[PDB]
Design a protein around this ligand. Structure first.
Ligand SMILES: CCCCCCCCCCCCCC(=O)SCCNC(=O)CCNC(=O)[C@@H](O)C(C)(C)COP(=O)(O)O
Ligand code: SF4
Lengths: 185, 156, 52, 98, 112, 175, 84, 318, 100
């Protein structure tokens, strides 16, 4: 803002998509033993925005003249508790949900072992801190609707995003689909 | 730096391995497949260079789009490209594959295979003579030789 | 003439065994596998989607 | 009796119990049949080798000859059952009652 | 005038009803087989829209010909002749919305 | 440790038997049977039965169960059932290992275990004989006497195999 | 398991209720679909498909077009299922 | 030092497989008026290194998603059995001297089919499963003749001990005695090793890659190494069984040279056959074995039983 | 112990290669790639079994040739071989050898 006074600094929330790092992260947490959940994710309300929505928001901000010098904030259509979101992820993926909460000291040795790795501390600990943080609600900043784009619900786009993680677990057993995550709104 | 030297030598090794053993896939749609076979024919035999035709996309490293890519054939071409493991390189042979060629204005022709899959080397010709195709393959080998994957990794 | 003498309620619903044979179910043993022969196939000349 | 005899007799007992407790598949039960035959082969071979019953060293072979005959019969039945029901499931062998 | 399949508009309507029935029941199978991400209701709504597109037709032969084309498309979808791309082509997802009011058209381009 | 190779092998044999007896998908059952057959060959070889044990490796592992596998492949199930797939299968698998451990420990701790028979914990090397067989393989000569002495066995076994071919044909006719 | 006429009516009414385009309040056994409920021909086709799904018997087109009264659906189902 | 001997058997065999790949490529090229790989190293000697490195650095695709334990065991079993089957061979002194090394090799060959059996199944594809089934049938069909022919020829050896084959053929090659059996045995080796004209398993022209269609990078390399090691081992078994070599007890080098040369000749014959003939149809393959070969093998087995009795040439048991 | 050593070494070597080929190259950084009929001809497999049984019965023949009752041995060996040939001929003539 100092260098570019009229720059449009967009402030997006968690972004999910086909090549996401947020949803896919939770999907791959199943590989990492059980499902590590700080406070069982009961203190982390999340509001994920769809990648296509974010991109189109950026484009429209570029096109629209009013966007200049406006700190836009991209928020997801709904807010979910971390537990709810992770549960829905494991449901659409049909992966066995093994949520073990993380006591600070007890799982701190696990985090220390992750850091002890001679390579990066498993994408640093700051990523785990991000997981250990609910999305800020900043209504003063303009949102997607201000640009005209309407945020697509996660539930509709979750299937596409997490079908890649869907394995014979769902391929062999078509069964039925799952139910939307609990919305803390 | 010593680390940079080790990284550079390792990247030289892997690039040499990949360019020496280039396994194109048996993918020929139209006329240019004939000149491709003539490249495989004894006169310009590609096997000397390590170029061996392997049918399996999963066991193949380069895709040669030899022929006109129709709208009906395009999804299959994309699928076979995606099933191909990486590192993967695409060589477009023929004016038809490069930009549509003779049938550029046809309703049923994709105006170039670059629209469907990324292309590394474009071989002009209609048909490109087998020597031109061998030249394009060797140019692809030089392109692999110039790759600096491990150097970029070390610089991060 | 019942399927079984002194039939219980559950057995009462059950029909008597057939006179000669059991009626076979609808297939469910074998079918015709459908294969896309080409187009990438070596023998398909590259542009033949032979649905066999 | 040395402990190896105990182990092999235990293996036969376990295989017998597995055969007598089906779950769904007939092939698993036929596997238990073949397994029991293996236990019997090993037991007979150990007995005959230890006692130097030279003329009985062929008994294990005949046992296996008829073991494979029985296995073959079992598979020949299993294929027909699968054809008539679509699975090898034991629960489909229900037409005959009492 | 020689009838293609129906001598009257009513018979063509009966054939349309049959074709609609078949498409309606086929839609969930299409969604399952092609692994489409749309819902069954969404697909059936698209089917309804496509059928209403041809509603204005007031000639029995045209209705019969449209029915033939619908049957051919349904046979393609029932088999796996059509790919996921072909099935989703009905849903013009990539194409950007084209505004229809006069003022937007005037802004965008010279097109009438 | 090499003093009780036969016992270690017998325990592995029992474990494989628990594996295919718990009834996972016939693939894993086949694996357990294959391991058990190899281990039984090992025990037989240790007792001096090279030929007999090798027979299991070929006419049992590469024979009866080689087709068992070919069969399961034709009748493919939707999911490969494993020990953990069903709680009962996993539970029985663990209990079977535990049962073996209990008898094994009892046999070693109590010089004389008596489950249904009486077993002595002394190593199997004790029972072996100190005689010499000279320029001969006793197992080989006994097995080869099937043609010189066991002519009646040869007749009955050959007839049974021929009737087995006919029987399998008739059963697979299916009318 | 006597397949009562009132049970058939209940199943028919439940099926009609599930259909969103029909407003539940004005739904009645005698409410003709086209006029009372305002649904179109394809709508009627869909509801007949729902009915034949619920009762498990296929309704041909000629019989289906004679419908458009829920009471007609119930009595047709009774005729095909031989009720009374 | 026994571990040293194990390594000396293992690593050179793998190097021989690696260079057998180049040899095959060059021979096929020259019989097709082409030149084999020659850019990569002097006369193409460095091509296998490039091939291996390229394979290893390549992406490890794995959409098997079913019994990954099996999908990993199959390559392990294949490579391990290919390496093990080399152990009992006397060249001229075997690494492990078994009274019944021949039956051991038969059992190991029968087991090695499970590698193809599992790989194709755990792949959980279409071509993979059906191709694996065709494999089972192929190997199983020729295993019968392989055993009968082997029994028929060993009737002259007097034992299943591989080492005594050298003594038996001290004065003449056993091919002179049993050439019809030799021809059938050679075709049998071809079928068992899944080589052209019986390359139905992989069958690239018909099945995209067969059982290994879903195997890439290293596991595919292990399958390739197992295949070629089996080729060399089966040709070595043929050389020991029929084309016997003179063995001077004080200088084993002469026998080793002669044996190696004969095995090389037979492997070159394998490549030559791969180049010449087209592939037998799956159906025709079985027709050639059960209906055409199996009979003649039975007749020759009767003859080779009868001959020692009627010629008083029963070989010594020891 | 020699045979056990050989088995161990070979298995460990092959498994080591499988490790260096399943995990070691799996580290290399990449991205996302997405991704039966009842065979009645199995009768051939079953017939293999019953023929493999005769195969087993015939293996003792090299030692069987060392007996003094060579007449009885030869008669029984040819008896088994002729029974096998008869079985093959029966399956052949009854079209039981319907391969593929
Ligand atoms: C993914 C979903 C794909 C949807 C594809 C569905 C199709 O193929 S649409 C083809 C159907 N075309 C027709 O039925 C032509 C009907 N033509 C007419 O004129 C009718 O509207 C009538 C005769 C006026 C009757 O109209 P109503 O159905 O009474 O109003
Ligand atoms: S560029 Fe020419 S030769 Fe190649 S496919 Fe097109 S028309 Fe044929």
């Amino acid at each position: 803002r100092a260098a570019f006074p009229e720059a449009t600094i967009i402030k997006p929330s968690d972004i999910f998509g086909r090549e996401d790092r947020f949803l896919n992260y939770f999907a791959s947490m199943r590989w990492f033993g059980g499902v590590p959940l700080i406070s069982l994710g009961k203190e982390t309300v999340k509001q994920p925005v769809y990648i296509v929505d974010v991109s189109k928001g950026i484009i429209n901000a570029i096109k629209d003249p009013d966007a200049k010098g406006k700190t836009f904030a991209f928020v997801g259509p709904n807010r979910y508790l971390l537990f709810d979101l992770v549960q829905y992820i494991f449901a659409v993926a049909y992966r066995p949900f093994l949520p073990y909460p993380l006591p600070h000291f007890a799982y701190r040795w696990v985090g220390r072992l992750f850091e002890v790795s001679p390579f990066e501390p498993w994408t640093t600990r700051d990523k785990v801190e991000r997981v250990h943080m609910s999305d800020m609600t900043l209504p003063h900043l303009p949102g997607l609707e201000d640009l005209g784009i309407q945020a697509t619900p996660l539930e509709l786009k979750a299937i596409e995003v997490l079908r890649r993680h869907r394995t014979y677990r769902w391929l062999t057993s078509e069964m039925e689909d799952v139910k939307p995550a609990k919305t803390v709104n | 730096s010593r680390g940079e030297y080790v990284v550079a030598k390792l990247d030289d090794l892997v690039n040499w391995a990949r360019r020496s053993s280039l396994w194109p896939m048996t993918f020929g749609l139209a006329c240019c497949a004939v000149e491709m076979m003539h490249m495989a024919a004894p006169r310009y035999d590609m096997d000397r260079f390590g170029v061996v035709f392997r049918a399996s996309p999963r066991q193949s490293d380069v895709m040669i789009v030899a022929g006109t890519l129709t709208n009906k054939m395009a999804p299959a071409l994309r699928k076979v490209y995606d099933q191909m493991p990486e590192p993967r390189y695409v060589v477009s042979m023929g004016s038809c594959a490069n930009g549509g060629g003779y049938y550029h204005y046809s309703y049923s022709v994709v105006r170039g295979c670059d629209r469907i899959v990324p292309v590394d080397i474009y071989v002009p010709g209609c048909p490109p003579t087998a020597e031109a195709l061998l030249y394009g393959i060797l140019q692809l080998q030089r392109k692999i030789k110039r790759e600096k994957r491990l150097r970029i990794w070390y610089r991060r | 003439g019942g399927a079984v003498m002194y039939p219980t309620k559950e057995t009462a619903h059950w029909k008597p065994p057939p006179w000669n044979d059991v009626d076979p179910p609808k297939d469910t043993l074998v079918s015709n596998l459908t294969l896309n022969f080409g187009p990438q196939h070596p023998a398909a000349h590259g542009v033949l989607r032979l649905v066999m | 009796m040395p402990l190896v005899y105990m182990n092999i007799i235990m293996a036969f007992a376990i295989a017998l119990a597995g055969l007598l407790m089906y779950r769904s598949h007939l092939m698993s039960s036929l596997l238990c049949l073949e397994g029991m035959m293996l236990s019997l082969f090993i037991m007979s071979t150990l007995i005959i080798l230890n006692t130097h019953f030279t003329l009985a060293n062929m008994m294990p072979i005949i046992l296996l000859v008829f073991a494979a005959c029985e296995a073959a019969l079992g598979l020949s039945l299993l294929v027909m059952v699968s054809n008539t029901y679509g699975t090898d499931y034991v629960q489909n062998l229900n037409l005959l009652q009492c | 005038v020689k009838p293609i399949f129906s001598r009257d508009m009513n018979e063509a309507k009966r054939r349309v009803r049959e074709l609609y029935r078949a498409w309606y029941r086929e839609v969930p199978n299409t969604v399952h087989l092609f692994q489409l991400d749309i819902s069954v209701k969404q697909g059936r709504d698209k089917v309804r829209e496509m059928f209403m597109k041809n509603a204005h037709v007031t000639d029995p032969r045209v209705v019969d010909l449209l029915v033939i084309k619908g049957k051919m498309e349904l046979e393609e979808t029932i088999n796996v002749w059509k790919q996921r791309t072909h099935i989703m082509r009905f849903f013009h997802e990539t194409e950007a919305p084209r505004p229809t009011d006069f003022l937007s058209k005037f802004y965008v381009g010279h097109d009438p | 440790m090499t003093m009780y190779i036969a016992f270690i092998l017998s325990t592995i044999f029992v474990i494989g038997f628990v594996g295919f007896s718990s009834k996972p998908s016939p693939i894993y059952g086949g694996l357990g049977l294959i391991v058990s057959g190899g281990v039984g060959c090992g025990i037989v070889l240790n007792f001096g039965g090279s030929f007999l044990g090798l027979m299991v490796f070929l006419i049992y592992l590469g024979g009866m169960l080689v087709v068992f596998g070919y069969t399961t492949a034709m009748a493919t199930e939707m999911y490969p059932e494993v020990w953990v797939s069903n709680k009962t299968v996993f539970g029985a698998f663990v209990s079977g290992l535990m049962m073996e451990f209990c008898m094994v420990y009892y046999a070693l701790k109590e010089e004389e275990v008596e489950i249904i028979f009486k077993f002595n914990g002394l190593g199997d090397w004790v029972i072996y004989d100190t005689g010499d067989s000279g320029f001969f393989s006793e197992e080989a000569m006994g097995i080869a006497a099937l043609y010189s002495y066991g002519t009646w066995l040869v007749i009955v076994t050959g007839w049974s195999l021929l009737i087995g071919v006919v029987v399998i044909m008739e059963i697979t006719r299916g009318n | 398991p006597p397949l009562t006429l009132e049970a058939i009516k209940d199943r028919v009414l439940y099926v009609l209720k599930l259909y969103d385009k029909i407003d539940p309040e004005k739904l009645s056994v005698n409410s003709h679909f086209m006029k009372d409920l305002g649904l179109d021909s394809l709508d009627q086709v869909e509801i007949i498909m729902a009915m034949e799904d619920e009762f498990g018997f296929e309704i041909p087109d000629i019989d289906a077009e004679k419908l458009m009264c829920p009471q007609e659906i119930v009595d047709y189902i009774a005729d095909k299922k031989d009720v009374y | 030092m026994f571990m040293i001997n194990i390594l000396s058997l293992i690593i050179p065999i793998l190097l021989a497989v690696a260079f057998l790949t180049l040899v095959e490529r060059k021979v096929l090229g020259y019989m097709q008026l082409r030149k084999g790989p020659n850019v990569v190293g002097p006369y193409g000697l460095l091509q296998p290194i490039a091939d291996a490195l390229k394979l290893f650095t390549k992406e490890p695709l794995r959409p098997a998603t079913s019994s990954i334990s099996m999908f990993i065991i199959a390559p392990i079993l294949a490579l391990s059995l290919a390496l093990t089957m080399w152990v009992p061979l006397p060249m001229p002194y075997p690494l492990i001297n078994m009274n019944l090394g021949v039956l051991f090799m038969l059992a190991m060959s029968s087991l090695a089919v499970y590698s193809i059996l599992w790989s194709g199944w755990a792949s959980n594809s279409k071509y993979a499963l059906i191709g694996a089934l065709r494999a089972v049938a192929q190997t199983i069909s020729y295993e019968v003749t392989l055993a009968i022919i082997l029994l028929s020829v060993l009737l002259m050896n007097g034992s299943y001990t591989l080492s005594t084959l050298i003594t038996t053929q001290e004065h003449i090659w056993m091919i002179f005695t049993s050439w019809p059996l030799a021809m059938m045995w050679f075709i049998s080796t071809l079928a068992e090793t899944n080589r052209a004209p019986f390359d139905l398993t992989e069958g690239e022209s018909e099945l995209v890659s067969g059982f290994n269609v879903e195997y890439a990078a290293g596991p595919f390399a292990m399958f390739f190494m197992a295949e070629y090691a089996n080729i060399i081992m089966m040709n070595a078994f043929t050389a020991i069984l029929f084309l016997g070599a003179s063995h001077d007890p004080h200088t084993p080098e002469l026998y080793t040279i002669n044996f190696v040369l004969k095995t090389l000749a037979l492997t070159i014959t394998f490549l030559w056959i791969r180049a010449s003939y087209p592939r037998f149809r799956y159906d025709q393959l079985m027709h050639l074995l059960w209906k055409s070969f199996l009979p003649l093998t039975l007749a020759l087995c009767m003859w080779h039983i009868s001959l020692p009795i009627m010629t008083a040439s029963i070989p010594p048991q020891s | 112990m020699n045979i056990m050593l050989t088995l161990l070494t070979n298995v460990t070597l092959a498994s080591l290669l499988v490790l260096i080929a399943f995990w070691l190259p799996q580290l290399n950084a990449y991205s996302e790639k997405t991704s039966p009929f009842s065979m009645k001809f199995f009768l051939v497999a079953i017939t293999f079994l019953l023929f493999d049984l005769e195969i087993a019965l015939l293996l003792p023949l090299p030692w069987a040739s060392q007996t003094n009752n060579l007449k009885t041995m030869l008669t029984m060996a040819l008896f088994l071989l002729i029974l096998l040939a008869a079985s093959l001929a029966y399956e052949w003539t009854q079209k039981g050898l319907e391969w593929a």
